[model samples]
Target: EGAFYTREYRNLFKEFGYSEAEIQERVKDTWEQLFGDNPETKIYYEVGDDLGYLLDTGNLDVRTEGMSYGMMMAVQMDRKDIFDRIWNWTMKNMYMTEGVHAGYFAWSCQPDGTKNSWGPAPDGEEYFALALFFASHRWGDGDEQPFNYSEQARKLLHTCVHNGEGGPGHPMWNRDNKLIKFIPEVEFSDPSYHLPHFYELFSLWANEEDRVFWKEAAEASREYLKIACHPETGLAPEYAYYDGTPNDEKGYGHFFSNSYRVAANIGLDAEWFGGSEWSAEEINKIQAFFADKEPEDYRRYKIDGEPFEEKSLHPVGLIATNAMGSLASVDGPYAKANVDLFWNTPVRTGNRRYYDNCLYLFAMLALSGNFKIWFP
Candidate 1:
């Protein structure tokens, strides 16, 4: 049986000729680098006795994106303690209690639990919901406020869709388009935020009344990818409109940091749900475009493949994601080349290590088949 029906995950490293022992060691070592006590690579930090946060090292701030990603990583690694700590910290510091953004988590905060921004990013909400569902299934929920993972996830999702129905805030996704917005207040979307694979699972696990919306969102996202990505290069703008054109208003229409996730997302979607042919085709094109480019020379680029002088801040992250794209592009000509490049690249260190290492560990977990879907 396959991933969707039977939950069988593929270990791409094994298929690509690495021994199982090496694959396992790589995954464990990579995890240790990111979550272990090492000051060189660790991003996770404990606040109080029962709370923790993942720092955006480059910015020295705690972001919902990194926190939610930490939870997902912990859940996949079966570290319930880590997951709970991150979740508790998130609830205590990021959860907004009142005002127009009530029920949403603040996007950024200081490590000391001080608020940096009152706004919410939809990407974090989505990851938090999916990771919570996994936590509930993997470790069972608790009776406490934030420890009740499934209940908390359902409530958050309900808020995402129904926030402004009769209230002060706006919904995270457009009701008619079924596409996720960049933020609760925005009309546009981040291409990297479109996670159809997660939405597919959400359809089965979300609140019953909202299940259909998730399903439609999965389909809409798949179709949207066709338009969002460049026809030949397969690069997508960091931000795009409902109609799939690049949203350059904030100068984010170029392919850059956020755009890299589109490749990895496509790969995971294909692995989990037997993604559309378009996804495979698009990922292949992405690999092909970057086939001859080295990580050091990586640069911001137009979706059409024109490069900008500004070099990539997270070239190592881009390398990892391009390799993850192999999940959808197994048959692509440049797939093995991308994987080789990734396997040779080391986890990034220093202040910029947080985001790069997060993506690096995700790619390692995914390629080694450690990242999984938890069914209740």
Candidate 2:
């Protein structure tokens, strides 16, 4: 690690004055939990020379979401071998070269590298673009498709906002207001998909013409989160409209698995750029809402904070993200309490490992201040 970590010219970690023990433990422990033989949380598997992939072991699919996340983790850990392996698999199996979504990736695929769906998910595209940008800045780009990381990132970003401008599929974000859609043609958004933190860095890394859109998208997501997250409990729905109201289509309006990431996203935004005035208050409300509740008792809820009888599909993941909110949340007892809980928490094992482990690693990275932007 460097004396000072700079993310798009911002010093998020050192400025926080976090303890060295906490920082170092988070970095190394998370590295082992995923890449090492931590019997419970391991997700990486190599298939031979130039072949490896992050498996959604539970789903038994190699998804674009998990692939992008693995690339992000690999690049952050400086494991170029792992990064290249996963990226190669993504290109070989997930990428679309000719179709309605040529520049996009198939969102899901069977374990044997067969496409389960041709439609792409916007979340995976955003993550793929950012991770590629980071890899370019950290390890340097080459003259090829995946290895030319910066070019790949720029191409993806261009497709993200301009997918339907001239032909083919729809764009991932609404150009009129700069709000990201849940899917390319969808008019609604997923709360967890609002990554203002990523957009902030994207403005600088993406194509020059698209820079303004990303900056506006950053501001739009910040404001959108405030409206989406409950004023009293800070909970958001899994899907919401740009007006901040939850979208009821297909019953995705409840606060569930995908909604858990709003807290983590806002917290990191605040840590990285001192985000919005609502960021701190929102996270504090979220932490406070779950403060008295036990992890085993986590449940789904309406965006307005009314609890539903249905238990959380991924309670461990919710806890992981809630704890990550401490990066910016300010209630003394509650924020530190969450950090303590996450510190002792092991990655979730068994069939539900994919989602929970992803969120857990993110919590570890955020609390230890290791989740940061990369610069060349």
Candidate 3:
């Protein structure tokens, strides 16, 4: 009944009455714009013979977030060559070799492979693990370090939850609550980092000893989201306390860049797992919240729906995710309109194009029935 069993994906564009040719062409065109040699919109850059990275154009750095994301996108597109290149570059540059963070990766690095920060981000690590697993299933693992996709994913996940038994480093997840931290050293959580759909897969794919932990983590995350998200508005803060209250320590308590993914993540989870009724309800609230707002007027906001003076840095990305929420909606009010808006928006081409384009491509894939699971 679900994508896992049927392997049939919903082409939202087609469902909305677009022609098959138009849907396919848009997906292809979007992919080319982001991964092709278009300097304005392309975020991917090849460094050397066997390496590549997705640049965070706004920040002008290579981030594990983008690297892992690129790998995931490649595997979904069945581009093993692209997947391997990003994986190789990531392992060569971002993988931390020594000290307390031995098994984790550096979150950021310069395009030339210099570290911007020594710490790992849980969001990136989780994405890397799932993408690696997908790679192993889709193309099979090879006889090399980075090419051993399945093992590499398992090992990385092992470190994510088990890195500090007798070590100085902390685990990426909070051991007690099973929620992911914004950073390994932090006690707080990032609402966007909670991807129960990924955790559901990890429960099956992770090492035997950690399977239960991942299963529990999925349930914990699902429950946590119920509290973290505003009941009426469906907006989640970028960062939150384990108790689900907003964490304003760095003013990240507001719904902003990171918060946009909540809708997209929920949609994918529903697409994959058939979703809880609450999931559909939650996504509907998110769609309705922005139903009246134009992309040009999008702004940072308090989770209860108070708008900030600061306009959204990635309104295109927000639009993409909001439309993605349609996957979970049962013809909820504004679902079609949101998708219509996203369909009309072109891939961004300015200085801050990278993030929006990445999300844009992902939404395209998901909506077009291309984003999929590779079961071994």
How good is model 1 by TM-score?
Answer: 0.98
Better of 1 and 2 by TM-score: 1
Show where candidate 2 strays beyond 4 Å: 1-23, 331-333
lDDT of 2 at 242: 82
Deviation in angstroms for 215 in model 1?
0.5
lDDT of 3 by residue, 1-376 (tens): 4587678888888998878999989999998898889888899987667889999999999998899899999999888888989999999889999877888889999999999888888899999999999999998999988799999999999999988897898899998989999998889999889999899899999999999999999999999999999999999999999999999988999989999999998888888878678988998898888878888999999999999999999999999998888888847788789889999999999889888988899999998888898888
lDDT of each: 0.91, 0.82, 0.90
Please count the clashing residue pairs in each candidate, in the order shown: 0, 0, 0
TM-score to true structure, per model: 0.98, 0.93, 0.98
Q: What is residue 117's positional error in candidate 3, in angstroms? A: 1.1
User: Where does model 1 exceed 4 Å of error?
Assistant: none
TM-score of 3: 0.98
What TM-score would you give candidate 2 relative to the actual structure? 0.93
Residue-wise C-alpha lDDT for candidate 2, range 49-95, written one tens digit per residue? 98788788778888898999999888877888989999999899999
Q: Write the per-residue lDDT of candidate 1 for residues 131-198, one digit (tens) a residue.
A: 99999999899988889999999999999889898877899999999999998888889999999999
